Design goal:
This is part of a larger assembly, with chains A (about 90 residues) and B (about 120 residues). Chain A has about 90 residues and is an alpha+beta fold. Chain A is built from one helix and six strands, in the order E-E-E-E-H-E-E. In chain A, the strands form three sheets. Chain A has a two-stranded antiparallel sheet with strand order 1-4. Chain A is elongated. The two termini of chain A are about 45 Å apart. Chain B is about 10% helix and about 50% strand. Chain B has one helix and nine strands, in the order H-E-E-E-E-E-E-E-E-E. A six-stranded antiparallel beta barrel of chain B has the order 1-2-5-8-7-6. A three-stranded antiparallel sheet of chain B has the order 3-4-9, with no helix packed on it. The radius of gyration of chain B is 16 Å and the shape is globular. The relative contact order of chain B is 0.24. Classes of the chains: A alpha+beta (about 90), B mainly beta (about 120). At the A-B interface, loops of A face loops of B.
Chain lengths: ~90, ~120
């Protein structure tokens, strides 16, 4: 499966006289061709995706899109991680 | 060649298959760096004939579409002085798309005009 996304239209509305026709190019796109898993080893992302699915009753696709996303949907991903040894025993 | 011979030949050839034609002349006149067009209408007796086995071009674009062919010639007597330039045009309404006089060949004998061999462009 996949989910096309509307993006725009061709440069102009051309006219082709030799074929006796007029034409217009609609422009679509597809997302995340390579991804097929919809899984993560980020436990935090998994937890918040579960929370969003339970609270909101929609999909939650975790750390990156997949080509066949079902609109409406969410996506929880991590951007930045900061670890810190606050104490001898605590991190 | 004598002038009378050429005159007789031109008149005869036109009279084998003449067609009455309503030439319309649009002459562009330079006024303040732009053109003011004065339209005049003149009539002549004319014979039309094929001269070139040309191909019909087509020029469709966002301005519009028109197809023209270069095949037809023309042969007219001395009765009226003609001239075609960038700033001057001549057209007439043949039934099968209006014609347009592209280029004029003035047949002259001893510095005296006797008739115009002429070329056309049938604008569809």
């Amino acid at each position: 499966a996949f989910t096309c996304i509307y993006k725009g239209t061709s440069e102009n509305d051309i006219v082709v006289e030799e074929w006796d026709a007029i034409a217009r190019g609609i422009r679509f796109s597809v997302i995340a061709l390579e991804d097929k898993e919809d899984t993560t080893n980020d436990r935090w992302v998994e937890a918040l995706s579960r929370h969003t699915k339970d609270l909101l009753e929609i999909e939650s696709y975790k750390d990156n899109w997949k080509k066949n996303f079902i609109a409406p949907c969410a996506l929880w991903r991590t951007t930045h991680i900061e670890n810190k040894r606050i104490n001898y025993h605590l991190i | 060649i004598n002038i009378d011979r050429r005159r007789k030949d031109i008149i005869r050839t036109i009279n084998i298959n003449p067609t009455n034609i309503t030439i319309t002349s649009i002459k562009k006149t330079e006024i303040d760096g732009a053109f003011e067009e004065t339209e005049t209408e003149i009539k002549c007796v004319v014979r039309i004939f094929n001269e070139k086995t040309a191909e019909k071009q087509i020029s469709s674009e966002k301005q519009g579409t028109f197809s023209s062919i270069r095949t037809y010639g023309m042969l007219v007597s001395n009765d009226v002085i003609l001239e075609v330039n960038s700033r001057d045009s001549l057209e007439f309404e043949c039934i099968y798309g209006r014609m347009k006089i592209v280029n004029i060949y003035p047949q002259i004998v001893k510095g005296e005009l006797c008739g115009y061999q002429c070329s056309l462009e049938r604008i569809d």
